[PDB]
């Protein structure tokens, strides 16, 4: 999603200075050979300002998900995006509204549970303990089984 655009916009002025200065300060080498392939934590330490942890965790996991374990120029941009606020910031709430509109193209007065059933079916994600639990919990945010608009509205928001 917004990941590639955030990487592209990293070509800027404030984050360019941030990346260059970070490299000049605490990316130098001349170690004992421990291979700081995990210098992500070192950079988090040497930042002087830690951003919200979601950036850190998404970078820790999703980067080199194949197990590359290495940070490139583009991955330097990824880490620096993690440093500044290059986030999509919850995407567009217009997109959330449009999605919920497509959900109630049947116009159930709310996104029905079977909307979620078919959407998970399309996504094909394995039905774990998280699956079905999340759907019922969002629908039964009243804990009464009635799915309302604001329930899934806040369920989907805050995410990119």
């Amino acid at each position: 999603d917004d990941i590639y655009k955030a990487a592209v916009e990293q070509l800027t002025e404030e984050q360019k200075n941030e990346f260059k200065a970070a490299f000049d300060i605490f990316v130098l080498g001349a170690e004992d050979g421990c291979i700081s392939t995990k210098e992500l934590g070192k950079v988090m330490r040497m930042l002087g300002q830690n951003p919200t942890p979601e950036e850190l965790q998404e970078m820790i996991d999703e980067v080199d998900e194949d197990g590359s374990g290495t940070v490139d120029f583009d991955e330097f941009l990824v880490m620096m995006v993690r440093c500044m606020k290059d986030d999509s910031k919850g995407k567009s709430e217009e997109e959330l509204s449009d999605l919920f509109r497509m959900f109630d193209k049947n116009a159930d007065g709310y996104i029905d549970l079977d909307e979620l059933k078919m959407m998970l079916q399309a996504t094909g994600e394995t039905i774990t303990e998280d699956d079905i639990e999340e759907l019922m919990k969002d629908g039964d945010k009243n804990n009464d089984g009635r799915i309302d608009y604001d329930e899934f509205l806040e369920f989907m928001k805050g995410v990119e």
Binding site: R101, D148, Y149
Partner: protein, 74 residues
């Protein structure tokens, strides 16, 4: 809401949009060109109005979900 006024605005627009055409002030082929111009302009108008109906349907979506939320608040 005072339909005489709103219909009056509509009539003002239409008479304004009554771009009546003259006789020896256009060419036969030029008249064809103007006809196609109206054709395409109204086609775009129809597309915009269809999207307008779509967004109105989405407005009705918001109306029903909103009033249902309101009832749930009681």
């Amino acid at each position: 809401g005072k339909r005489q006024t709103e219909r009056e605005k509509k009539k003002k627009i239409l008479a304004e949009r009554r771009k009546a055409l003259a006789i020896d002030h256009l060419n036969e082929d030029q008249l064809r060109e103007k006809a196609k111009e109206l054709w395409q302009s109204i086609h775009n108008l129809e597309a915009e109005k269809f999207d307008l109906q779509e967004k109105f349907k989405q407005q009705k979506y918001e109306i029903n979900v909103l009033r249902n939320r309101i009832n749930d608040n009681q």
